[PDB]
């Protein structure tokens, strides 16, 4: 069994910004989801070897996880809030694509996604 390389968190070719919206995505949105009792399956790339999911990266071609998002936010990888919001939505969508409805992992993704939506509902206007 083999895991792919993780999504990149570093790319000096990619233009970067520190916006008040991206500051909110780290300080409020990522912080809120990270501390949740159901965060742990999403805090790092899916380990398809240790979890015995040999088909995971046959089905999920755009992997994303909060470990990667945390590194991207801390290392100012993003140009805008939409890039980071897309990463969160990719993470939730991957969970629903791969897993069965009502599986524990899907209930955990649903709980985190509800909090995500409550926090980005109050994403501040750009300064
Ligand atoms: C993003 N994570 C996953 O998609 C994932 C998939 C499966 C899994 O076995 N999925 C098969 C398709 C049912 C198992 N775990 C561990 C786990 C963690 C928490 C509760 C139950 C299981 C995961 O984290």
Curated annotation (Swiss-Prot):
Domain of life, per lineage: Eukaryota
Signal peptide annotation: none
Tissue: Ubiquitously expressed.
PTM comment text: Phosphorylation by CK2 disrupt the intramolecular binding between the bromo domain 2 and the NPS region and promotes binding between the NPS and the BID regions, leading to activate the protein and promote binding to acetylated histones. In absence of phosphorylation, BRD4 does not localize to p53/TP53 target gene promoters, phosphorylation promoting recruitment to p53/TP53 target promoters.
Covalent cross-link site, Glycyl lysine isopeptide (Lys-Gly) (interchain with G-Cter in SUMO2): 58
Location within or outside the cell: Nucleus; Chromosome
Protein name according to UniProt: Bromodomain-containing protein 4
First-to-last residue of the parent protein present: 44 to 168 of 1362
